[PDB]
Ligand binder design. Sequence first.
Ligand code: 4YL
Ligand code: ZN
Length: 107
Amino acid sequence: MNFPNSTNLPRNPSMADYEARIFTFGTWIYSVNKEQLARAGFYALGEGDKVKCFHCGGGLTDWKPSEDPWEQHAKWYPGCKYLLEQKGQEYINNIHLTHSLEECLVR
Ligand SMILES: COC[C@H]1C[NH2+][C@H](C)CN1CC(=O)N1CC(C)(C)c2cnc(Cl)cc21
Ligand SMILES: [Zn+2]
């Protein structure tokens, strides 16, 4: 499904600015907040609630009310350098431990 970009160089430079990302959404009806999405590096593709990160290229869909943009970014795209820059590895480990341990309690 395309490998995730793990370099310090964004895959989509045209979407590097917060403002550029914000425009891609338009009127947004979805449970997840467009400005929180833009902040977490995401821009809309115009395919329902599908977003992609400008940096890693990582795509995410089918946002539940309980699914946080930053947490999901870490969950599915842990190699993203934008994520590492913004949140730190301390945060990233926490999220990973949290989700890895969320699996324990469900089974
Ligand atoms: C459909 O999976 C579950 C949802 C649930 N809602 C959150 C926000 C995100 N979740 C992951 C996701 O959407 N994934 C993961 C992966 C890596 C399989 C992938 C690849 N491409 C695209 Cl477009 C999307 C996508
Ligand atoms: Zn990313």
